[PDB]
Design a protein around this ligand. Structure first.
Ligand SMILES: Nc1c(C(=O)O)ccc(Cl)c1O
Ligand SMILES: Nc1c(C(=O)O)ccc(Cl)c1O
Ligand SMILES: [Fe+2]
Ligand SMILES: [Fe+2]
Ligand SMILES: [Fe+2]
Ligand SMILES: [Fe+2]
Lengths: 173, 173
């Protein structure tokens, strides 16, 4: 009835899964089929998508440094996750995690979205800042529903084309 | 729109709130009015009540050692939270945290219970193991609704009297 197992040493768990906390994978969920989605995210990794999580996200940067590109008060802002920092992100704050360092490790905790509560993923234009593309997803498993989504955005000039100034978003990088 | 503030160094936050992570207080919530209830629990502290959380609880023992008295498969079991351990408790697993050491620090994460989802608190008989008393609570703030509850149990021989063998539960210790 300990559905998720006995306690276990977290530093050794992170050491042991080092090879998963690098490209191409980068992150690894700790427990399966739980309400709390508990993930360790490594590096390096950069991304252009912004996430619209309808729930809160908890961050604890155990190893290395990272940062969150945000949209707060309509203005682009950056929040640093220095090694040792903890942080709670309010629901719906657009965020784009940048993880420049190898060997970094960040604990991220979220919960399973209830049916009908959708995650959004959006890109914004470097030229005029308008919204470029947005996909909403009933997010049941990030590693499975998200890659195909990001890929169809990079593959389509149409999706990448800003409706305000015509600039075509660079895509992946 | 960063409702819960910017990131901040967690070890220094724990050092700075040392005096709250001792008796009589013992624990301290990190953010107010959030869906994720994020608590640091110190020591020393022992307790006889078992908690019936209708949701999951995440534990990360950053400093020192602790342990959880449990009821699993009807049998009394113990789960150690050695320094560095992480642990996810499934919903409704009865648990009684024992925190014998001063200077220990454990990160506990839960979420606000929705209306109608009740926490239970129960005591069991050292003589025959039957259930002795159970209070259900719409738990809106632990530090406010729980002390009066525990106190009314210690103050009442009636509540402390086992319905199976008549043994009167010791109460607080
Ligand atoms: N913020 C993240 C990250 C991240 O911090 O890059 C990785 C996976 C998931 Cl599910 C997240 O919510
Ligand atoms: N397990 C705990 C503890 C604990 O680990 O003693 C303290 C406060 C809260 Cl709200 C908890 O759920
Ligand atoms: Fe996210
Ligand atoms: Fe544009
Ligand atoms: Fe609890
Ligand atoms: Fe008894």
């Amino acid at each position: 009835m300990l559905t998720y197992g006995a306690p276990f040493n977290f530093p050794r768990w992170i050491d042991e899964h080092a090879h998963l906390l690098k490209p191409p994978v980068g992150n690894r969920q700790v427990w399966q089929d739980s309400d709390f989605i508990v993930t360790v995210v490594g590096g390096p990794n950069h991304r252009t998508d912004y996430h619209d999580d309808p729930l809160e996200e908890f961050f604890y940067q155990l190893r290395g440094n990272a940062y969150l590109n945000l949209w707060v008060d309509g203005r682009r802002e950056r929040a640093d996750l220095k090694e040792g920092d903890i942080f709670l992100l309010p629901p719906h704050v657009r965020h784009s995690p940048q993880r420049p360092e190898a060997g970094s490790a960040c604990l991220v905790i979220e919960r399973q979205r209830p049916a009908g509560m959708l995650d959004g993923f959006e890109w914004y234009c470097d030229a005029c800042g308008h919204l470029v593309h947005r996909v909403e997803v009933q997010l049941k498993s990030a590693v499975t529903d998200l890659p195909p989504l990001f890929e169809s955005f990079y593959a389509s000039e149409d999706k990448r084309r800003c409706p305000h100034c015509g600039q075509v978003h660079p895509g992946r990088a």
